[PDB]
Coordinates of C-alpha atoms and ligand atoms in Angstrom, one line a residue:
Chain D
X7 CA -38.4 -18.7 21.3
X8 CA -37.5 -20.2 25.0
X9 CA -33.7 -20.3 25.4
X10 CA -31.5 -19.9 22.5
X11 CA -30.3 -16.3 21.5
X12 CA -31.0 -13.0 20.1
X13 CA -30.4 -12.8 16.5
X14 CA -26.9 -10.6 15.5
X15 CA -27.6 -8.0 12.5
X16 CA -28.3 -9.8 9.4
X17 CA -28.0 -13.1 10.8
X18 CA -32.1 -14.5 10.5
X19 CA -32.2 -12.1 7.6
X20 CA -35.2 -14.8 6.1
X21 CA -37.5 -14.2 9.0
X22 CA -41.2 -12.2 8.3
X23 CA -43.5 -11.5 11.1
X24 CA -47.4 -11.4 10.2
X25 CA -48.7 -9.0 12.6
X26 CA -52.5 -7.7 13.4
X27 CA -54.8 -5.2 13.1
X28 CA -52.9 -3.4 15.8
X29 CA -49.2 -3.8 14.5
X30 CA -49.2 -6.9 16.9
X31 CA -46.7 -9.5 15.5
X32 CA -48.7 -12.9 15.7
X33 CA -46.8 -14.9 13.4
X34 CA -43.8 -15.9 12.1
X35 CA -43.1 -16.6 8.3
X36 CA -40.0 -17.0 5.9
X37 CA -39.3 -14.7 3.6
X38 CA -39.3 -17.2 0.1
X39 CA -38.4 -14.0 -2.5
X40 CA -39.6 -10.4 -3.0
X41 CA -42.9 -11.2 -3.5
X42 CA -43.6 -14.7 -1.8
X43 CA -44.2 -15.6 2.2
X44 CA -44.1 -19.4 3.6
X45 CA -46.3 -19.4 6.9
X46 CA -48.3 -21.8 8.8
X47 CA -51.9 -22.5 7.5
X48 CA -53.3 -21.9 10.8
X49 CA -52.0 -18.5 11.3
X50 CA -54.5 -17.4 8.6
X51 CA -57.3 -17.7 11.1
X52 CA -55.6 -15.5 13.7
X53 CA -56.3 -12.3 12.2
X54 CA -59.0 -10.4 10.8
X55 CA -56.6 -8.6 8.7
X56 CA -52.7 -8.9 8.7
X57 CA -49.4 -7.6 6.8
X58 CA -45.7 -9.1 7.1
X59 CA -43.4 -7.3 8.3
X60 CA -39.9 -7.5 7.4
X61 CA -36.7 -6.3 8.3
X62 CA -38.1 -5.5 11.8
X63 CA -35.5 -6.7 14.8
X64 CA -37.1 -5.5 17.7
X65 CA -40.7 -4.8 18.1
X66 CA -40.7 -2.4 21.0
X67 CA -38.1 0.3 19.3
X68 CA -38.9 1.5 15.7
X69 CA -34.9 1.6 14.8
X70 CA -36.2 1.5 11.3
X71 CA -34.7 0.0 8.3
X72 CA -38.2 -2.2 8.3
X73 CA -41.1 -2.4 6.0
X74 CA -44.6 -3.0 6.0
X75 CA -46.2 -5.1 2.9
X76 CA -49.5 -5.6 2.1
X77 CA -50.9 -9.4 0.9
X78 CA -52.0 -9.0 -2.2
X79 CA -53.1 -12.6 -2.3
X80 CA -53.1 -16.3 0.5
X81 CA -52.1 -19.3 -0.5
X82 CA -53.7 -22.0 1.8
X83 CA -53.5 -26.1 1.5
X84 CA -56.4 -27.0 0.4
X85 CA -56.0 -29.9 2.7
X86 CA -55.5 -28.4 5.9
X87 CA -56.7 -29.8 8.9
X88 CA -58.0 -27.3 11.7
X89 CA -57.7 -30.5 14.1
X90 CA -54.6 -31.9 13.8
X91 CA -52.8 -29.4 11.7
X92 CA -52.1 -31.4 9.1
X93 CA -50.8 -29.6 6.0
X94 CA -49.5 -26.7 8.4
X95 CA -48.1 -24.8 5.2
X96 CA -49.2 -21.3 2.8
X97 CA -47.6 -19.1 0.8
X98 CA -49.1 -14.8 0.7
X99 CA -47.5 -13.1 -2.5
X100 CA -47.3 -9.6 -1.5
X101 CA -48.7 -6.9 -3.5
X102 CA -45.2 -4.5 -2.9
X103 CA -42.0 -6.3 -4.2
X104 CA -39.8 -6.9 -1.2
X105 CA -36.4 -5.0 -1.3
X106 CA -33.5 -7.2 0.2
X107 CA -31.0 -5.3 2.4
X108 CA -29.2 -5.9 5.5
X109 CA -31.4 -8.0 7.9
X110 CA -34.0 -8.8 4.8
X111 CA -32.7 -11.9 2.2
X112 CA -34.9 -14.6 1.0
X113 CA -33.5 -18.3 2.4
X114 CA -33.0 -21.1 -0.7
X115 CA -35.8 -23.6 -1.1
X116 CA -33.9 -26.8 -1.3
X117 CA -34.2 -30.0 -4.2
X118 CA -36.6 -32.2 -2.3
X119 CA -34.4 -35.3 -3.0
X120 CA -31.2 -34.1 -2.0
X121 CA -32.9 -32.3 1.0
X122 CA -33.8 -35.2 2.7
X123 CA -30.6 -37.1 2.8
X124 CA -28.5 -33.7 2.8
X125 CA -30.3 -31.6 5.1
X126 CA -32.9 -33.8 7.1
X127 CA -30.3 -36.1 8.0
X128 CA -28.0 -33.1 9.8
X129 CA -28.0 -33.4 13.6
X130 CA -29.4 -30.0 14.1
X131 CA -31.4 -27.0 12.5
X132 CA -32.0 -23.1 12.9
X133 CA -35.9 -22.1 14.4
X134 CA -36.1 -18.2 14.7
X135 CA -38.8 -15.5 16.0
X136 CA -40.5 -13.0 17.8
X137 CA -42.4 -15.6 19.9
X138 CA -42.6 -16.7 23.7
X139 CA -39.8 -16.6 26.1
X140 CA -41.7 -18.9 28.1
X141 CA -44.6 -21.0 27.7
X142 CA -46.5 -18.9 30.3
X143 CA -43.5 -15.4 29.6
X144 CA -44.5 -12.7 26.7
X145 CA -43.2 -12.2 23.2
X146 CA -40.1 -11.3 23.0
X147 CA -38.7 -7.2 21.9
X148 CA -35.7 -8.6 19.5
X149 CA -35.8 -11.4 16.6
X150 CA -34.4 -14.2 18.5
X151 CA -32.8 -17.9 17.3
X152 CA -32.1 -21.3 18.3
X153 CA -30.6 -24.2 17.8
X154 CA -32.5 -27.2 17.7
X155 CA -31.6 -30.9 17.4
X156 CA -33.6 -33.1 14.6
X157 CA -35.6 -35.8 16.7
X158 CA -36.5 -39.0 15.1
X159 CA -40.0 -39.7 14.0
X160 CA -40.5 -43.0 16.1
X161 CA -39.1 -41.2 19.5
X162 CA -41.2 -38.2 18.2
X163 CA -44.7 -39.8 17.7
X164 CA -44.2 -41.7 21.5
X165 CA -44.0 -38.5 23.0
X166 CA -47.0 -37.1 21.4
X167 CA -50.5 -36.9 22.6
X168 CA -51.4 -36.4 19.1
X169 CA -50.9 -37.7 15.9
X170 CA -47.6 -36.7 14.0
X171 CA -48.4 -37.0 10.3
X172 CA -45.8 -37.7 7.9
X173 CA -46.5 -33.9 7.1
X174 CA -44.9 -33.3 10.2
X175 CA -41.9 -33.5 12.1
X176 CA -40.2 -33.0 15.6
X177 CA -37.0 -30.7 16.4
X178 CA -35.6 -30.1 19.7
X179 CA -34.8 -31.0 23.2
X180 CA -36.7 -33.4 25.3
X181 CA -36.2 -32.1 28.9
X182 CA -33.6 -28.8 28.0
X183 CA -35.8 -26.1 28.6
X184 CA -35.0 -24.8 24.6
X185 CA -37.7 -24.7 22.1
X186 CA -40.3 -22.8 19.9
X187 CA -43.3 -21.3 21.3
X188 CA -46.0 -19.3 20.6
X189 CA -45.8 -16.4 18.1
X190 CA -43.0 -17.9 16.8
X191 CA -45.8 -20.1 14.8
X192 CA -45.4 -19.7 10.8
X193 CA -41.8 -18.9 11.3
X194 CA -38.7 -20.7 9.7
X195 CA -37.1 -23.4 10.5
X196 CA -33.7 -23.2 8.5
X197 CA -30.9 -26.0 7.8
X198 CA -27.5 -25.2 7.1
X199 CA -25.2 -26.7 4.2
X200 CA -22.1 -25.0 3.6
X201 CA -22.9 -22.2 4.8
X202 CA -26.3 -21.6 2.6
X203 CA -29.4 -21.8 4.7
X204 CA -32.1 -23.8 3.3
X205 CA -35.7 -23.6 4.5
X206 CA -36.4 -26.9 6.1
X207 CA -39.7 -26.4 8.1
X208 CA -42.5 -24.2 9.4
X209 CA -42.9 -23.6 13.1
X210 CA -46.7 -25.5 13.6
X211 CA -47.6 -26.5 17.2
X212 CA -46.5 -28.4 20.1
X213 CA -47.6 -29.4 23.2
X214 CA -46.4 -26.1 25.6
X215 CA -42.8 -25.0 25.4
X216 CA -39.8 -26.7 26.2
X217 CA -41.4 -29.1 28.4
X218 CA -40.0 -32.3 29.3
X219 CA -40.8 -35.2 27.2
X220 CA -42.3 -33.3 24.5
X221 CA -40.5 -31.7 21.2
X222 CA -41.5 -28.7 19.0
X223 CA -43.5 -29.9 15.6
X224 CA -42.8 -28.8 12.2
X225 CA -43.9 -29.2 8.9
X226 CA -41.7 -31.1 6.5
X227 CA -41.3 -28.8 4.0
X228 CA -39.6 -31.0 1.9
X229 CA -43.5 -32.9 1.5
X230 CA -44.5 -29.8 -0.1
X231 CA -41.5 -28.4 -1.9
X232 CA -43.5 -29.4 -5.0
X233 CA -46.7 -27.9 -3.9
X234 CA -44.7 -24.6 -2.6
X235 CA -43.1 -24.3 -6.5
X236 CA -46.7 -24.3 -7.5
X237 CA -48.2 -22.1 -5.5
X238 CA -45.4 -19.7 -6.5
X239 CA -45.5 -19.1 -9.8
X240 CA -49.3 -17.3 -9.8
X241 CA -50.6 -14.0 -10.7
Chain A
X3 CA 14.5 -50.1 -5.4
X4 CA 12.7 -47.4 -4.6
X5 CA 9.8 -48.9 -7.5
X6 CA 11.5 -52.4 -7.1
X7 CA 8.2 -52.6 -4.9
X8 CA 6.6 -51.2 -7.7
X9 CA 4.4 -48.8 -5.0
X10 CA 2.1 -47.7 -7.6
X11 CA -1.3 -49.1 -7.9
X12 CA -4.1 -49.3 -10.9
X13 CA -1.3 -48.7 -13.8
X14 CA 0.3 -46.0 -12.4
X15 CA 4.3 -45.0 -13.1
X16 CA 6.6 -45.3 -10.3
X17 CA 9.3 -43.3 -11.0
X18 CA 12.0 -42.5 -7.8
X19 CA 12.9 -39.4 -7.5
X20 CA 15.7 -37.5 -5.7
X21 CA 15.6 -39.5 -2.5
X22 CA 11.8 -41.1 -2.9
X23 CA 9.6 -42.4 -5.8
X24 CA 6.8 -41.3 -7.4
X25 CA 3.8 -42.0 -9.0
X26 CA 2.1 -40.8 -12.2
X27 CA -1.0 -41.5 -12.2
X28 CA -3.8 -42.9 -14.5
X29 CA -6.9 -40.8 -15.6
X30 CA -9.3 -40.8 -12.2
X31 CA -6.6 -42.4 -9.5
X32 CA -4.8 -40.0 -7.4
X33 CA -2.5 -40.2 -3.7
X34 CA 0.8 -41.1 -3.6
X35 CA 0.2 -44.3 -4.8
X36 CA -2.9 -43.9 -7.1
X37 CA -4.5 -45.5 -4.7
X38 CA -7.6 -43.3 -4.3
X39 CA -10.2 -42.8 -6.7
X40 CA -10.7 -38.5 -7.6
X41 CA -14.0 -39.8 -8.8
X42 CA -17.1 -38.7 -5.8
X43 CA -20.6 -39.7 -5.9
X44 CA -23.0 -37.3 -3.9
X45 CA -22.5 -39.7 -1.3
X46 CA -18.7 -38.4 -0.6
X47 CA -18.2 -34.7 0.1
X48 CA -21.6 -33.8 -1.6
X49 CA -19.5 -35.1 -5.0
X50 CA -17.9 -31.8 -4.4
X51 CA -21.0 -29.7 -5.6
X52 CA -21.6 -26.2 -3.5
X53 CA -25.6 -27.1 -3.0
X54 CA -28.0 -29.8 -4.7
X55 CA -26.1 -33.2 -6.1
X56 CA -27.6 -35.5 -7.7
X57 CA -26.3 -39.2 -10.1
X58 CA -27.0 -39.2 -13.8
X59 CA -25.4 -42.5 -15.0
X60 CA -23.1 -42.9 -12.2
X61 CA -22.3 -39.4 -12.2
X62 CA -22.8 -36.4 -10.6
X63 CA -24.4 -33.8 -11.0
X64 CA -24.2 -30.7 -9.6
X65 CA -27.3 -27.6 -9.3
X66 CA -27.9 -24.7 -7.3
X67 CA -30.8 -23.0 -6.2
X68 CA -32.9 -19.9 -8.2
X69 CA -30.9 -16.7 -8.3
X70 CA -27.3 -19.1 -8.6
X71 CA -25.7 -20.5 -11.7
X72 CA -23.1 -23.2 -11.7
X73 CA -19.7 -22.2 -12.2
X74 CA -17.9 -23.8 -15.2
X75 CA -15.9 -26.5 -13.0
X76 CA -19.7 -27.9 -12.9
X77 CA -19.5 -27.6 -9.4
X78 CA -19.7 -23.8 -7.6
X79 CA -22.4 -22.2 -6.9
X80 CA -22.7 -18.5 -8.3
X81 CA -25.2 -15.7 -7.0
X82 CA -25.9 -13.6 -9.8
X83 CA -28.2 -11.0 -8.1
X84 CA -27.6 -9.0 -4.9
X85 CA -28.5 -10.1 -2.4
X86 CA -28.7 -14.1 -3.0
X87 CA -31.2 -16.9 -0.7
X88 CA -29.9 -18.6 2.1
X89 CA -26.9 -15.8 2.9
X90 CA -26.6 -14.0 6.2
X91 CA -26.6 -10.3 5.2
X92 CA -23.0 -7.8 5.3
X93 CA -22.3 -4.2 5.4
Ligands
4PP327 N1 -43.2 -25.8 21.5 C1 -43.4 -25.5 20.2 N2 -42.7 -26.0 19.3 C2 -44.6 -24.6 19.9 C3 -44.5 -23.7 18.7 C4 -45.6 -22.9 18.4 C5 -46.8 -22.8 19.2 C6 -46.9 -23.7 20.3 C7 -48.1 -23.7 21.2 C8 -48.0 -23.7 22.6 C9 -49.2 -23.7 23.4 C10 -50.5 -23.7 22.8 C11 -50.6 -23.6 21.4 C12 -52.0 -23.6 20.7 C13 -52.2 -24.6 19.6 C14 -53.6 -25.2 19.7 C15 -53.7 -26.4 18.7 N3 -53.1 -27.6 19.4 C16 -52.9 -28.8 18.5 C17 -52.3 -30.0 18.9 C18 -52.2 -31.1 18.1 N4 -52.6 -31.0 16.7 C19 -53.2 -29.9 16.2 C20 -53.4 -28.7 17.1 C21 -52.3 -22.1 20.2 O1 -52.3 -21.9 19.0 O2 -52.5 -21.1 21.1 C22 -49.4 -23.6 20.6 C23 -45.8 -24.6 20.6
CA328 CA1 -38.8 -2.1 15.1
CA329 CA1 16.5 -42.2 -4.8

């Protein structure tokens, strides 16, 4: 994350972290119940082998109260695109049942109707992780947050030097140095309504971080709320 | 005089009190003068519902999201379990 904030105890509760073969955290996810992870397609061909990792607020200091979980089984789009990133979205059901605690809570999948003139419609959202502090900076030791304004589709797509599908959309700031980066990929991008926080979109790709002209893009979860339902009720 | 101007709106009952009037109020009109409707679509206020709204022959409503039920009112939003979704985390 470049700019925003550090998140306080239990505050990004929702937030997983895939990480590597060496412990690395490479990814971002949102934690979607005990068993079930939402993450970025594309983060599934980071890793030879990866867990999630949960309840984890600072990478560098083993403070505890964290756990490692095994992924029993991935859940890709079939229709992913490794070129544009279209249909950005999977879901890993864990083989051990998560056990929500402080700092590790599950974030509300919204109705897709109501989501999109609710919660799509707000003038800003909630994109967390473990990611850059700087496009060319290193990931950072504490969960961090930020705030970042919805963008409109139109404004969006003319800043982009590549396609933005209706799978997609843009969140943040066009010159503010504030935005998602790398690591922070897979990772939640939460809405707030009433003081609930309902998963909104998954932290895809962009063009750098926080440069000017140029947004973060998400995918619109609310295109595959349907197709998320589905993948979670298996085995 | 007070109701000589008959203040009250959509078959209401003026009726003056000590030193002002009052209104009684028909079934789905309330404010001073029964002059709003206590009736909300989604569109106003969410239609008063704690999460999802939605219209069912002009009329709302209310859901809430797994691990919630809907409190009796037909609007609230009750987690049954624990630790519920989309809740910062205490203690
Ligand atoms: N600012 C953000 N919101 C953001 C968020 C997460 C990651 C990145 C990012 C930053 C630099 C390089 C890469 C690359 C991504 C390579 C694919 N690039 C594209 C571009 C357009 N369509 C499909 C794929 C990386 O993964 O290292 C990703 C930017
Ligand atoms: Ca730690
Ligand atoms: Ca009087």
């Amino acid at each position: 994350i470049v700019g925003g904030q550090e998140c306080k105890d239990g505050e990004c509760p929702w937030q997983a972290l895939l990480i590597n073969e060496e412990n690395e955290g490479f990814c971002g996810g949102t934690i979607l119940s005990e068993f079930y992870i939402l993450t970025a397609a594309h983060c599934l061909y980071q890793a030879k082998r990866f867990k999630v990792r949960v309840g984890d607020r600072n990478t560098e200091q083993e403070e505890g109260g964290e756990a490692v979980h095994e992924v029993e089984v991935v859940i890709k789009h079939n229709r992913f695109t490794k070129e544009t990133y279209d249909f950005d979205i999977a879901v890993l059901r864990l083989k051990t049942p998560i056990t929500f605690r402080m700092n590790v809570a599950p974030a509300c999948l919204p109705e897709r109707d109501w989501a999109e003139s609710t919660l799509m419609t707000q003038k800003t959202g909630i994109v967390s992780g473990f990611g850059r502090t700087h496009e060319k900076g290193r990931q950072s030791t504490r969960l961090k947050m930020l705030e970042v304004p919805y963008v409109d589709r139109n404004s969006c797509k003319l800043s982009s030097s590549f396609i933005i599908t209706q799978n997609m959309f843009c969140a943040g700031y066009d010159t503010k140095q504030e935005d998602a980066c790398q690591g922070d990929s897979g990772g939640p991008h939460v809405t707030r309504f009433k003081d609930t926080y309902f998963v909104t979109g998954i932290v895809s790709w962009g063009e750098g971080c926080a440069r000017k002209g140029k947004y973060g893009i998400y995918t619109k979860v609310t295109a595959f709320l349907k197709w998320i339902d589905r993948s979670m009720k298996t085995r | 005089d007070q109701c000589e101007t008959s203040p009250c709106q959509n078959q209401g009952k003026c009726k003056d009190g000590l030193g002002e009037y009052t209104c009684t109020c028909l079934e789905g009109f309330e404010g001073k003068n029964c002059e709003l409707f206590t009736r909300k679509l989604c569109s106003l206020d969410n239609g008063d519902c704690d999460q999802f709204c939605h219209e069912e022959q002009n009329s709302v409503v209310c859901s809430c999201a797994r691990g919630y039920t809907l409190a009796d009112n037909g609007k609230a939003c009750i987690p049954t379990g624990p630790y519920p979704c989309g809740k910062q985390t205490l203690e």
